[PDB]
Design a binder for these strands. Structure first.
Ligand SMILES: [Ca+2]
Ligand SMILES: [Ca+2]
Length: 76
DNA sequence: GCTTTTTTTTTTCACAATCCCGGTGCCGAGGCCGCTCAATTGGTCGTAGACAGCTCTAGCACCGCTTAAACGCACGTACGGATTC
């Protein structure tokens, strides 16, 4: 298997559609070829929690925990 | 060679200590139970250190002289240790 910032790239990159990108449609695609452990959902929200704050991923619209994201940082 | 007497050896009577039975009694080892908190699973992230490669410190070897030091022996003193008190 590959890492979870390896997995988060594959869903949003391949197709590009529902709610810009959001939490359910990412986890549906991700499970098909990561091969699911129980920790999948726990370390997929953690991967998002540190990727949104670093600059690799930037968020479109939300409040606190919920929302929707993109890949290209804002103004870049 | 005898006596006497002093020392040492031998036995012969004692007594705490031990052990094996029995029997009894109590409390803490040893196990159970219902948690929870600390080890485990999994993945992410950053650097500690094996490893290769270079430098060049300093550790080893070698020699031949000078003489301080070690070695060995002659000699007798004051020490160690036995004995006695
Ligand atoms: Ca479960
Ligand atoms: Ca280093």
């Amino acid at each position: 298997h590959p890492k979870y910032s390896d997995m988060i790239v594959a869903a949003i990159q391949a197709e590009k559609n529902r709610a810009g990108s959001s939490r359910q449609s990412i986890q549906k695609y991700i499970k098909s070829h990561y091969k699911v452990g129980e920790n999948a959902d726990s370390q997929i929200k953690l991967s998002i929690k540190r990727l949104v704050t670093t600059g690799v991923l930037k968020q479109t619209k939300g409040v606190g925990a919920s929302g929707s994201f993109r890949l290209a940082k804002s103004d870049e």
